[PDB]
Amino acid sequence: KELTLAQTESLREVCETNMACDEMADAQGIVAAYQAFYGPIPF
Ligand SMILES: [Mg+2]
């Protein structure tokens, strides 16, 4: 389902310090970028 603002931001912070995630999230969105590097969202 839909993420809260804080949930989305928690994913964004992790991806921001991974240049490869960061770039991937540009066009793939934060969720698939997150999960591609870090696995299924846990919450
Ligand atoms: Mg933040």
Describe the structure.
It is classed as calcium-binding protein. The entry lists the keywords calcium-binding protein, bone GLA protein, BGP, bone. The assembly is monomeric. The protein has one domain. The protein has 2 helices and no strands. The protein has helices spanning 5-16, 19-38. 16% of the residues are buried. It binds magnesium ion.
Helix-strand topology string: HH
Q: What is the count of β-strands?
A: 0
Distance between the termini: 11 Å
Rg calculated over all Cα atoms: 9 Å
Percent of residues in helices comes to over 70%
Q: Categorize the overall geometry.
A: globular
Ligand names = magnesium ion
Biggest sheet statistics: none
Binding site for Ca(2+) 2: 13, 16
Function: The carboxylated form is one of the main organic components of the bone matrix, which constitutes 1-2% of the total bone protein. The carboxylated form binds strongly to apatite and calcium.
Domain Gla: 1-39
Protein name: Osteocalcin
Give a short synopsis of this structure.
This protein is mainly α and 43 residues long.
List the helices and strands and how they pair.
Blueprint: H1 5-16, H2 19-38
The structure holds magnesium ion (MG).
Protein name: Osteocalcin
Binding site for Ca(2+) 3: 16, 22
Function: The carboxylated form is one of the main organic components of the bone matrix, which constitutes 1-2% of the total bone protein. The carboxylated form binds strongly to apatite and calcium.
